[PDB]
Amino acid sequence: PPGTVDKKMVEKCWKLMDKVVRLCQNPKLALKNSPPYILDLLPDTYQHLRTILSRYEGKMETLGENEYFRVFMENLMKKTKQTISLFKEGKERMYEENSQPRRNLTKLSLIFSHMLAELKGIFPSGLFQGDTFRITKADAAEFWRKAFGEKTIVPWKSFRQALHEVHPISSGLEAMALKSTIDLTCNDYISVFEFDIFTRLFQPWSSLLRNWNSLAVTHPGYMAFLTYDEVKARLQKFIHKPGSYIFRLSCTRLGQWAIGYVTADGNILQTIPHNKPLFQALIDGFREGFYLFPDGRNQNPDLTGLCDHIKVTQEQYELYCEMGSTFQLCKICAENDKDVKIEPCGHLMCTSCLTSWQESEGQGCPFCRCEIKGTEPIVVDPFD
């Protein structure tokens, strides 16, 4: 658990948000207007923090002791610094839109968008309501209830253990890919907010991990977080091949899928499935003749059977973890660059995370838990 929140610390936390706004306002960045838009998100977050701070005028002591708020204010500060220090490494590079520095900045923009949607849904109108927060899914709610009570936020370790007992997680690699999908704010905790979003995306709860594995980890269709212009641009490659479709998440509508697709007229359209789980929109859109070729590919998965339990290669996980971010980054901390390789499993990571896993009596390789017989140094930005 992080320490307490005295106002001295919310103040620094605002001086930082201001530094990132300045850095990101630079005309050279020519940051795309399109969401997630960090130049809106930070002001907005600042403004809700004030809203919160006003509703706790007398009660400023019981606010400081709120676990969720302590974790959130510490993540906000860490992420705000990671952004600042990003600009400080990247320098001149920040100014070309396809840089790895600029890629990282776009991953962070998303995280800010997730932290605000969490803050607004846990402190609606400025008042803590996390202990009452309703998990949209009966079975999922039961799970959180039975395992966690009215806790708003739980550490990943605890969450992983808990979930494992009902939907078994067979390998550190699967676990790492799971954590990659649920842990939206990237702080090593799961909130009842994130838990609700996930369980909605990958319902029905009865076959949860089996749904995520088939829709997210090994589906060519899955695009994770895309803008709509980004969807159109990826389908344009297939504008002459009716039935081509991809599906994506939307930072402005957490918890819902959006399917893009190519029609026989040479048009890209888009629909939000709302009624069923995604795998039933996809099964139906196939039967109907609309969703045929995921990402342009002729071999489209067979999802029936989601209603003989498809297994996943460790490689498929590894590649899936690499999916969200630049390759340069350690997918343990999501903060530093990779700089070491682990024999004989082959996994990459930053030296800091590795010696940390060891110092904490971790079992072998932080990813797969297999035994290291050796390690070796790698450089991720060779020409700099």
Q: Where along the sequence are the contacts to Ca ion (CB under 5 A)?
A: 183, 185, 187, 189
Q: Which of 330, 301, 123 is nearest to 211 (CA)?
A: 301
CB-side exposure of 305: number of CA atoms within 13 Å? 10
- Closer by beta carbon to Ca ion, 153 or else 278: 153
Quote the least distance from Cβ 229 to Ca ion, whole Å: 28
65 in a known ligand binding site: no
Cross-strand partners of 375:
342
Q: For residue 36, give the amino acid letter.
A: P
* Residue, CB closest to Ca ion: 185
Q: How many CB atoms lie within 10 A of CB 350?
A: 21
185 binds, among Zn ion, Ca ion, none (CB under 5 to 8 A by kind): Ca ion
φ, ψ of residue 225 in degrees (nearest 5): -85, 105
- Closer by beta carbon to Ca ion, 94 or else 249: 249
- Closer by beta carbon to Zn ion, 323 or else 333: 333
- Closer by beta carbon to Ca ion, 189 or else 279: 189
Instruction: Report if residue 330 touches Zn ion, rule: CB under 5 A.
Output: yes
189 in a known ligand binding site: yes
259 binds, among Zn ion, Ca ion, none (CB under 5 to 8 A by kind): none
Annotate 354-376 with b (16+ C-beta within 10 A) or e (fewer).
Answer: beebeeeeeebbbbbebeeeeee
Contact criterion met (CB below 8 Å) for 228 and 327: no
Pairing state between β 258-262 and 268-271: antiparallel
Among 268, 332, 340, 348, binds Zn ion (CB under 5 A): 332
353 binds, among Ca ion, Zn ion, none (CB under 5 to 8 A by kind): Zn ion
Contact criterion met (CB below 8 Å) for 34 and 229: yes
376 in a known ligand binding site: no
252 in a known ligand binding site: no
Cross-strand partners of 376:
341
> Following CA atoms 9, 104, 29, 113 in sequence, which dihedral angle do they give, to the nearest 10 degrees?
-60
187 binds, among Zn ion, Ca ion, none (CB under 5 to 8 A by kind): Ca ion
183 in a known ligand binding site: yes
- Closer by beta carbon to Ca ion, 183 or else 196: 183
68 binds, among Ca ion, Zn ion, none (CB under 5 to 8 A by kind): none
Q: How many residues does the chain have?
A: 384
Instruction: Report if residue 365 touches Zn ion, rule: CB under 5 A.
Output: yes
Tokens at 157, concatenated: 């370790």
345 binds, among Zn ion, Ca ion, none (CB under 5 to 8 A by kind): Zn ion
Distance CA 25, CA 42 (A): 12
Q: Which of 306, 209, 193 is nearest to 255 (CA)?
A: 193
Q: Which of residues 333-352 bind Zn ion (CB under 5 A)?
A: 333, 345, 347, 350
248 in a known ligand binding site: yes
- Closer by beta carbon to Zn ion, 225 or else 367: 367
How many residues at the interface with Zn ion, by CB under 5 A?
10
Angle at 224 between CA 138 and CA 194, to 5 degrees: 35
* Binding positions for Zn ion, rule: CB under 5 A: 330, 332-333, 345, 347, 350, 353, 365, 367-368
Annotated binding site: 183, 185, 187, 189, 194, 248
Annotated binding site for Ca(2+): 183, 185, 187, 189, 194
